[PDB]
């Protein structure tokens, strides 16, 4: 019903060449392009096209950027080739999901991020200190709803499954990788918001969570405790960017790939159908990319020191 | 169009279309074309990483993360793949062949000034350059390049072998069929090969002025009676001014001529392969093409294609050939700056 885009934008790669004309129809020679202009070109073009698609579909959207490590399954390589074409690598990643996204960031980096990224930027703290929330995932017959719960566990919000229309993966040697996505939420049908508010999803007991959801109403496949701190920046031209810092610890898990505390930083915005007509999404995308690159460069040293993920070929 | 990148989904059967990613062939004028660059590398390196301390990944002790590759290694790997492919094709045929590394500059041309995008990735450029073959190689050198190449040969312990031998090259056309011919200096008919068929051409575009081109070419077998008749027959008379054709009665007309001062430095490489350094000072003499005129000095590597039975180390041979081509380019570079097209 709608096209979707997948991109693996590895940094420090320049797949393009400048076509420099030389005087003596036309004639030219090839020259080395800049280090990473092509990445920004692809990101901006795909963002603009998919945002146009959304606008013609009067669908809301969100530009979601998070920081973590993208670990490829060892089965991605064929015939044991260390070096492979980027186009082939992307077409291989798309076919069967060999990629594994791990949103994380070292604990000690928080002060450095606040002093050298949040404070120098227009980013200012908002909200009321730190808010504790429970993020849960309810699988159903044909859909996978998401639910937010307060300290008591009451149903704060019910949301439909995120649909990703554009999924980019900025990848860096030393620093944490950056995943950039454009997401949409098909409207929750109204009964569901009611259905899940009345029925107690979870039953708190001395800070221990036991599922009490009626089994016919899906299963609580995923559940986690979240400590959320919000920062916001409303720059000129009426575009807002939000830094959500989440200390997340899962409680009820389905698979053994998500079982540890994790610190996540997410840059988010909004692309309303009406606003996007008068909004240059080019600037929003470029600003998000630049901010992500700056923070990745800031935290690269401590990410390497604490996690040791240094991809050297 | 807009799908020139790996976006907008996964089109089915990508491995079939992208199996020959390192080059560009259109199955049934070189058949095989690849374009390289000294600072551009579409290749991405899949390294080995240790995600022992990640959250959620404490049992997996090995994972893969994509990173950038130095363009030297990516070009090495692409050239090795293309060379292995062309070697496989040659060995499938009975063709004997050779790989020549020539020096010069490559110039292209756009069909129409409109719809010309300033910055494109390599593969679409390769597609455009192989669609109608809109390119031209200009082999250039200087007199200082003579001393530079002499010093390079002395450093590489090259053998002197041939010195300043003079020969000629001519082409005879019957119907549209074309014959290449090599003649000895004293108007002696020497060798009657068929024109070179290049199965693989690589435009390795360096950053600086000197530019390297690797070409793998083979000769079809020559049918006996025509070549034998050509051997004894006098084809090229020489007046005191220049050469002239006396081959009319039983041959098609001559189209091209040339005089070659040839200087060959040969040596055995690290592996069991013999390589040559050919210095060719060519004077066009009689020509029919509007661009051939002008004396041209060329420096080339020439390596005969090793046979299948010899079973030479292909990877090491490719590494040595790339290293020697880079050495040639580096030696020629300091002398080659004044051209500026």
Residue numbers in the entry:
A (entry chain A): 152 to 175, 185 to 473
B (entry chain B): 134 to 161, 171 to 483
Please give sentences taken from the publication describing this entry.
We solved the cryo-EM structure of the complex and built the model into the final 3.4 Å resolution map with an AlphaFold prediction of the dimeric complex as a starting point. The final model comprises RESC1 residues 152–175 and 185-C, and RESC2 residues 133–161 and 171–483. For each subunit, a small N-terminal domain (RESC1 46–100 and RESC2 51–107) connected by a long linker (RESC1 101–151 and RESC2 108–132) is predicted by AlphaFold but not resolved in the final cryo-EM map, suggesting flexibility within the linker region. In the model, the tertiary structures of both subunits resemble each other, with an RMSD of 1.159 Å. Each subunit comprises an imperfect β-barrel composed of 10 β-strands that are surrounded by five α-helices. The inside of each barrel forms a tunnel that is accessible to solvent and possible ligands. The subunits dimerise through a domain-swapped β-harpin (two antiparallel β-sheets, β-2 and β-3, connected by a ca. 15 amino acid long loop). The dimerisation interface of the subunits provides a contact area of 2426 Å2 and involves about 28% of the resolved domain, as calculated by PDBePISA. In each subunit, a hydrophobic patch binds the β-harpin of the other subunit, mediated by interactions between β-2 and β-3 of the hairpin with β-4, β-5 and helix B of the barrel. Both β-hairpins carry hydrophobic residues for binding to the surface of the barrel, but their connection loops differ in sequence and chemical properties: the loop of RESC2 contains charged residues (K195, Q199, K201, N204) that interact with the surface of RESC1, while the loop of RESC1 contains hydrophobic residues (V173, F178, F181). The RESC1 hairpin is more flexible, indicated by the lower map quality that did not allow model building for this loop. These differences in the domain swap configuration rationalise the preference for RESC1–RESC2 heterodimerisation rather than homodimerisation and the instability of the subunits when expressed alone.
